[PDB]
Design a protein around this ligand. Structure first.
Ligand SMILES: *[C@@H]1O[C@H](CO)[C@@H](O[C@@H]2O[C@H](CO)[C@@H](O[C@@H]3O[C@H](CO[C@H]4O[C@H](CO[C@H]5O[C@H](CO)[C@@H](O)[C@H](O)[C@@H]5O)[C@@H](O)[C@H](O[C@H]5O[C@H](CO)[C@@H](O)[C@H](O)[C@@H]5O)[C@@H]4O)[C@@H](O)[C@H](O[C@H]4O[C@H](CO)[C@@H](O)[C@H](O)[C@@H]4O[C@H]4O[C@H](CO)[C@@H](O)[C@H](O)[C@@H]4O[C@H]4O[C@H](CO)[C@@H](O)[C@H](O)[C@@H]4O)[C@@H]3O)[C@H](O)[C@H]2NC(C)=O)[C@H](O)[C@H]1NC(C)=O
Ligand SMILES: *[C@@H]1O[C@H](CO)[C@@H](O[C@@H]2O[C@H](CO)[C@@H](O[C@@H]3O[C@H](CO[C@H]4O[C@H](CO[C@H]5O[C@H](CO)[C@@H](O)[C@H](O)[C@@H]5O)[C@@H](O)[C@H](O[C@H]5O[C@H](CO)[C@@H](O)[C@H](O)[C@@H]5O)[C@@H]4O)[C@@H](O)[C@H](O[C@H]4O[C@H](CO)[C@@H](O)[C@H](O)[C@@H]4O[C@H]4O[C@H](CO)[C@@H](O)[C@H](O)[C@@H]4O[C@H]4O[C@H](CO)[C@@H](O)[C@H](O)[C@@H]4O)[C@@H]3O)[C@H](O)[C@H]2NC(C)=O)[C@H](O)[C@H]1NC(C)=O
Ligand SMILES: *[C@@H]1O[C@H](CO)[C@@H](O[C@@H]2O[C@H](CO)[C@@H](O[C@@H]3O[C@H](CO[C@H]4O[C@H](CO[C@H]5O[C@H](CO)[C@@H](O)[C@H](O)[C@@H]5O)[C@@H](O)[C@H](O[C@H]5O[C@H](CO)[C@@H](O)[C@H](O)[C@@H]5O)[C@@H]4O)[C@@H](O)[C@H](O[C@H]4O[C@H](CO)[C@@H](O)[C@H](O)[C@@H]4O[C@H]4O[C@H](CO)[C@@H](O)[C@H](O)[C@@H]4O[C@H]4O[C@H](CO)[C@@H](O)[C@H](O)[C@@H]4O)[C@@H]3O)[C@H](O)[C@H]2NC(C)=O)[C@H](O)[C@H]1NC(C)=O
Ligand SMILES: *[C@@H]1O[C@H](CO)[C@@H](O[C@@H]2O[C@H](CO)[C@@H](O[C@@H]3O[C@H](CO[C@H]4O[C@H](CO[C@H]5O[C@H](CO)[C@@H](O)[C@H](O)[C@@H]5O)[C@@H](O)[C@H](O[C@H]5O[C@H](CO)[C@@H](O)[C@H](O)[C@@H]5O)[C@@H]4O)[C@@H](O)[C@H](O[C@H]4O[C@H](CO)[C@@H](O)[C@H](O)[C@@H]4O[C@H]4O[C@H](CO)[C@@H](O)[C@H](O)[C@@H]4O[C@H]4O[C@H](CO)[C@@H](O)[C@H](O)[C@@H]4O)[C@@H]3O)[C@H](O)[C@H]2NC(C)=O)[C@H](O)[C@H]1NC(C)=O
Ligand SMILES: CC(=O)N[C@H]1[C@H]([C@H](O)[C@H](O)CO)OC(C(=O)O)=C[C@@H]1NC(=N)N
Ligand SMILES: CC(=O)N[C@H]1[C@H]([C@H](O)[C@H](O)CO)OC(C(=O)O)=C[C@@H]1NC(=N)N
Ligand SMILES: CC(=O)N[C@H]1[C@H]([C@H](O)[C@H](O)CO)OC(C(=O)O)=C[C@@H]1NC(=N)N
Ligand SMILES: [Ca+2]
Ligand SMILES: [Ca+2]
Ligand SMILES: [Ca+2]
Ligand SMILES: [Ca+2]
Ligand SMILES: [Ca+2]
Lengths: 388, 388, 388, 388
């Protein structure tokens, strides 16, 4: 095997088709399905899999009580076959912790998990299913990372981490790994003012990450990485189609180099594909809660501070719960272009559905089509009343 | 691996032997078995597997209520090891949707699933476990396909689809795929007046499909495809041994080029092997309901409008529930001829057994013998009372 | 891979060591374990596995009621990893039916299952996981076979079948298979008067089978097969150490060429290793019921009508239930000799424990040591009261 | 594959990072998790796995009552994927018995299990998943072994066994195996006065084992083995940092060549890494019970009878239950040095938590870092009240 190189551009996105769906909450009402959150999707050269952070309990188990909580000793990054649910019996543990990323370089997989108390967390970088490198907290305040796949180019896999406040300036670092070893790291540069939970993809030897400015911004920060020079830039999505949550209503003109104000100290992981006229943004439909999900075609969203939608697709109705969303691609597919994909975490239970004592999710995932396909909506599909 | 070519003829069918049986409803009374319907069987060069459309719930799960319904967002094409039941833990998702087909070309597998609302459905064609092509609805009325295996010849895998009314003329198309890409498609030609749910097999470079005329016919339409020329014909089975369900009583003379009347706007998926004197037709025993199943040797059924049985075999007694049936063969077996096989879906629950709130099925499957073997009957075997 | 040849002799048996044990009834009290009976063990070149006839239900499932019955449509030959229990999720179906045998020839595996009603049963011979040959009943009275592994030599795998009465003369045939095809068959010859359920092993190009004379004999019939000439002989074990069950008390002098009388129309599958002074016989400890199990070293048991034990080993105490027993060896092990192995079926439930409505079993298995090892007893270990 | 040679030294241990954790008791509250105890970890060239002795029952099963007991016929050595729990469906049985060790030699795995009654136990040595050698009890008093991995060098895998009293002099033997065959054995020599449950690791062609002196010592005995000469020495850890349990309080000066007194006839399996200044000792925090766990850096612990800690790391708080602990390394990792690892058995249930009727455990495991990482504590995490 050789290292994968990002030699292709994105395919033209004219609509989205269903890729995978696990129905995990429905199925786990009467089967041994692990409680999860913070899911994602990532491909190897011969398989694509679902990933998430387990809570170390099944959803029917009594230990599901309290699973709203973000960072226990009972969490782990798990992976499982595409569109199956994350069960006790089919889930492979990648590493232990409560914040993660993972990516394949074409030869083997790197997985990273962070664990520890808030003031003393540490990352362990696994490569080829073995621990290789460890990184201690630098700011002593919830060292944390992407919660979706990283991207590699000629063996170099950049990863974005943040340590520090969620409600003020923090210390974001871009690490450049190869074979699980640190080649370099850099502090965040550019105009993004706060970074969390980056969702990344690669095309034509560039990695684009769309992140969460938890502190101030309802527009999303964007980091663009050159994995050969091992350098980066940052800015925000200029468009007035705002894509964090909660958020104010859409204005007429956005902000390219500062957070678009109105909502502080909150957010949701999300994503975009930023490719000129071939630009699509994901967002929750609700401005107030993690409800609904839609894709909007917003030509030149990155650079045009008045750009508005020219096409769209509903993924989850506003009467259904959504959650985190992120990017991935099958870098090992056939053909001349990389097909954009994404997933949406469909969160069930607390805090929105507090008649149960747990929080979990299922997954839906879509990839782009060059056709203009009809649209459906893709809810989680479980009935909370069945769990009472 | 090279593409498989249909170089052999059918083996002489002198009886049927048991091939597989999953006992899924019996077992799922106390294990984590998925609710399914629309099953089939399909072989790879090194394994044969069971397939079906999951309902995204176990049979004991509370989400089994409502599984009579045909087309939710919680359905998927799954496959699992031959004669095991479709469990949460052993079922592999092939694609997401509520109508499917799948076949191996000798190199790798093509799977197709259709999803969406009734007026906006779309097919995704997967090849080598990756999405490759997408097809939007052309008639905006429940785009739908075979619900059993497709057949390939030198890489060309024809698939029959229908979009449009179930109770009048519809728009049937034969697509010719290779490596998941569309080489060509054609509209239905010939004398079949309505086509659904084709059951296909190949021999000597010809693919024969026996389908369901839902609108008018109690005889079955037959499509015969030349996968090299990428052309086809259609007609009906001429025989007065009528094989849809519900149906009128058997007459003395059938119809070769039009639907045999008596029953409108209903049917069941079924199959036949049409090979001169070596012709066998499957059918439900009941003329009114999906009850019983039998194979009848009807020499020259395709072409002889007075042909009657010369031999038969009971598969399921008329006091037991049956369901869909379809053809498959192990194109990669040893020997000089292809051994005809079929499966019968044994539907349990609604609507016939409405003391439970679910609908599911198990599978029985048989292949031909050149011996004249004794016959048994093969019921599902579950006791509905245990589920109350 | 080449076909395995029986080139080695037996290792010297000085005691028995534990080889495998599945604890299936204990575990299945609270897990998804299939109801089974008629187990055995058989090796491939790279793995050894447990085998049995499933009943198509879990032990806690409501469909376990009635599993005393021998021959339903819901039975199948399954295999699973050595010493795991036969679960819904780990059991591989080999073929469908209610009487079986299986063996590896060094290249791939042959499995045979018989199904059907009592007057119309048929065997299907699978090779390389595909059906190849079928054999119809010849006597119309419960066609039946070994219920333990067959043995192959240079691709030729003999199998013993019986069709006909269990309580009078029957029609026993030795079939010689190669690649799942029939090379030859012969009717039973020699002095054995009734044959069922042969337990076989091979050494130095000879296959020895120890069987059950259900009709008359409390000594066991022995068939010795030359798999090159494809010929055989039969006789009884001469020893007065009688090894069927139920049986009369041991006499002083046995019978070499006729059934030793006292018990009619009953028996149990069992085994022996017949190798001159290196001869060991298995038997139940009880003369009346399938209780206890012991191995007795009986030099020249086959040929010496006064031979008595010179050594022994208790396997299951007389206060614990036993059941069928049979021979197997790992023909692909390292070293200069074949190590004798056996299993004992530990039957729980009906008819002896009729407070439950099911019948199932677990497995214990042992192989020979050249050491004189200490002995333990190996009960099933489940508590029936837990199942009430 | 070639046999692995111990060519590297230990990496510098500056802290410990999380390696694996199975959360088995939490998960098994509502899934089919086997009852276990005496766990460990061991690597193959391509995978690392968890190991333990099953009790042949699930934790929710009724047969969990009585699982405090050490030595039944229902125990087996099982292995399962790293950080998954030991389930019915994912656990591979290595051999049958109630005392074990296992190690890979670079070509394949040797596993050893001991079974039998107290006065008649026997070891079976498996190699390449087949039984090869058997060893009978020599002292007729609970033949027993390491309960963690063995270590191999150029195919020679030494294993320490003891037979005899737990409360006085016993007969300890070091066996030197190759390909599952006995090359040599030696009686214990040196100054250790009683040996049980050795925890071993290898570096620079030497194997170091830290054991349990059940009879007298609260310091731990150490055996150092030359696997080329097939010779050994023994002594105690000199340090006054005492590491058995129960134990007296730490003194100022320890004992190098005799047991440090204060506690008789009890102990716990434990471990150390003894490498000059790079020396780390594990121990329970409590002096009275199997509570808490910590690692202490004790330069020259082996040889310096006044050595005290210079650094430490808490692994399990003193308010949480611990248990056995042992060493392992991934001898097949990349890089220039072997990374020290260990596990801690987190025992739940009897005797400390006697509101339940079972005894089981989960696993936590850590490996060394050259960084000075922040520390967390890693409890089992189950709530006993949920099991009532
Ligand atoms: C079968 O399936 C197919 C395929 O899926 C279905 O067809 C799809 O149908 C959907 C729904 O209609 C479409 O999605 C919407 O797309 C529009 C964009 O298209 C419109 O606008 C285009 C741009 O027009 C402008 O520029 C052009 C270019 O110069 C100019 O010509 C024009 O005058 C104007 O200045 C038009 O080009 C386009 O027309 C074309 O397509 C038409 C078909 O759609 C066709 O009829 C035409 O002939 C022509 O070819 C079309 O007019 C998105 O704008 C829209 O998204 C908004 O609305 C949804 C709610 O519906 C909302 O959730 C979105 O967030 C968004 O609206 C919010 O954000 C705006 C941006 O800031 C803001 O302005 C809004 O006020 C609104 O904001 C509020 O809500 C948000 C969210 O809660 C909140 O944050 C804010 O604060 C605030 O409260 C949809 O995405 C698909 O594109 C269409 N696909 C295709 C291929 O056709 C078909 O319907 C199905 N069939 C059946 C029978 O069901
Ligand atoms: C052990 O196992 C073996 C192997 O399985 C068992 O043997 C099997 O036994 C079964 C049951 O008997 C047989 O199946 C039936 O086969 C007959 C066909 O064979 C008969 O007809 C042949 C043709 O005769 C005509 O042509 C010849 C050729 O010229 C001519 O000579 C003759 O005069 C006549 O004009 C005969 O050749 C054949 O004889 C041969 O075989 C005999 C053994 O079977 C043997 O004794 C003879 O010596 C000779 O060798 C034989 O007479 C099928 O017709 C039959 O199917 C009909 O009946 C079943 C109900 O039983 C029904 O469900 C079927 O649908 C079908 O009948 C319906 O459809 C007809 C067609 O339209 C219609 O005419 C009927 O009125 C009826 O229609 C009604 O019901 C349907 C369905 O509900 C409904 O849709 C309609 O509207 C309407 O209401 C069976 O398939 C096997 O062939 C036989 N196999 C073998 C190898 O022998 C054996 O019994 C077992 N042993 C034990 C002890 O159990
Ligand atoms: C730790 O583990 C070890 C290893 O497992 C334990 O040692 C084992 O201990 C057991 C139990 O004692 C032994 O099994 C029995 O073996 C005897 C055979 O050995 C005896 O007989 C030999 C033959 O003697 C004759 O020939 C010689 C040769 O010429 C001649 O010298 C002699 O005078 C005589 O004519 C002796 O050679 C042998 O001595 C040797 O070994 C001794 C140790 O065992 C040792 O002390 C000596 O120095 C010497 O070295 C020894 O005397 C079997 O006969 C016996 O099986 C019978 O009894 C059991 C019940 O215990 C029964 O279930 C069996 O079925 C069988 O008895 C039935 O069948 C007979 C045959 O028809 C019949 O005659 C009986 O009446 C009886 O029949 C009744 O019951 C059956 C069944 O229900 C029913 O069907 C009938 O109708 C009827 O009702 C045992 O197998 C192991 O061999 C021994 N192993 C070793 C290596 O030592 C050790 O005990 C353990 N330690 C601890 C502390 O627990
Ligand atoms: C974020 O994470 C990091 C990384 O984990 C956290 O930092 C870690 O913090 C822990 C907790 O503080 C540290 O563990 C302890 O380490 C000490 C050892 O370090 C001290 O001692 C060193 C040696 O000093 C001596 O020699 C030097 C060399 O000459 C000499 O200079 C000195 O004067 C003296 O003579 C010092 O070098 C060292 O200083 C260095 O590090 C300091 C940071 O720790 C730093 O501030 C300094 O500047 C300097 O750089 C330091 O002073 C262990 O001794 C200790 O273990 C004892 O205590 C724990 C309880 O806390 C107990 O459980 C242990 O068993 C042990 O104590 C028992 O055994 C002793 C031995 O017999 C005995 O003497 C005791 O009385 C006691 O015995 C009793 O209990 C036992 C057990 O129940 C029982 O068996 C007995 O019978 C009896 O009842 C801890 O392991 C880490 O080392 C430290 N790691 C790092 C890299 O810094 C950080 O805190 C986290 N941040 C936050 C915000 O939480
Ligand atoms: C796409 C779809 O919903 N197809 C239906 C099919 C259909 O209604 C008739 O053929 C009429 O068009 O009928 C049946 C049926 O049991 O009759 C099941 C199928 N269910 C599923 N494939 N999910
Ligand atoms: C084919 C069949 O039903 N064989 C029977 C067998 C048989 O009844 C006797 O050998 C008499 O012929 O007995 C027994 C038995 O436990 O005695 C079980 C077998 N059960 C099964 N193989 N399923
Ligand atoms: C073979 C055996 O039973 N070994 C025992 C061990 C032993 O009792 C002491 O070391 C004293 O000899 O103690 C313990 C223990 O928890 O202390 C568990 C072990 N349990 C098992 N390995 N099954
Ligand atoms: Ca925000
Ligand atoms: Ca019809
Ligand atoms: Ca369950
Ligand atoms: Ca008998
Ligand atoms: Ca001690």
């Amino acid at each position: 095997r050789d290292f994968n190189n990002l030699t292709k551009g994105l395919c033209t996105i004219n609509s989205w088709h269903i890729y995978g769906k696990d129905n995990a909450v429905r199925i786990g009402e009467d089967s041994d399905v692990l409680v999860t959150r913070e899911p994602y999707v990532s491909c190897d050269p011969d398989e694509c899999r679902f990933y998430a952070l387990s809570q170390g309990t099944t959803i029917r188990g009594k230990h599901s009580n309290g699973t709203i909580h973000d960072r226990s000793q009972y969490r782990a990054l798990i992976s499982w076959p595409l569109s199956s649910p994350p069960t006790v019996y089919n889930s492979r543990v990648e590493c232990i912790g409560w914040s993660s990323t993972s990516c394949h370089d074409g030869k083997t997989r790197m997985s990273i998990c962070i664990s520890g108390p808030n003031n003393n967390a540490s990352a362990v970088i696994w490569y080829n299913r073995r621990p290789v490198t460890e990184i201690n907290t630098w700011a002593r305040n919830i060292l944390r990372t992407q919660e979706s796949e990283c991207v590699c180019h000629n063996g170099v896999c950049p990863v974005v981490f943040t340590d520090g406040s969620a409600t003020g300036p923090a210390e974001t670092r871009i690490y450049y790994f190869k074979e699980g070893k640190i080649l370099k790291w850099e502090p965040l540069a550019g105009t993004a003012k706060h970074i969390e939970e980056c969702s990344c993809y690669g095309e034509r030897a560039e990695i684009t990450c769309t992140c969460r400015d938890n502190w101030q911004g309802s527009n999303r920060p964007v980091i663009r990485i050159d994995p050969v020079a091992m350098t980066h830039t940052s800015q925000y999505i200029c468009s007035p189609v705002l894509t964090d949550n909660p958020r104010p209503n859409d204005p007429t003109v956005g902000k390219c180099n500062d957070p678009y104000p109105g909502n502080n100290n909150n957010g949701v992981k999300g994503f975009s594909y930023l490719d000129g006229v071939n630009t699509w943004l994901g967002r929750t439909i609700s401005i107030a809660s993690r409800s609904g999900y839609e894709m909007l075609k917003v030509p030149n969203a990155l650079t045009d501070d008045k750009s508005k939608p020219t096409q769209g697709q509903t993924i989850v109705l506003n009467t259904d719960w959504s959650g985190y969303s992120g990017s991935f691609m099958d870098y090992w597919a056939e053909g001349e272009c990389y097909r954009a994909c994404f997933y949406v975490e469909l969160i069930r239970g607390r805090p929105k559905e507090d008649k149960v004592w747990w929080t979990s999710n299922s997954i839906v995932s879509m990839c782009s089509s060059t056709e203009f396909l009809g649209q459906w909506d893709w809810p989680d599909g479980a009935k909370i009343e069945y769990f009472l």
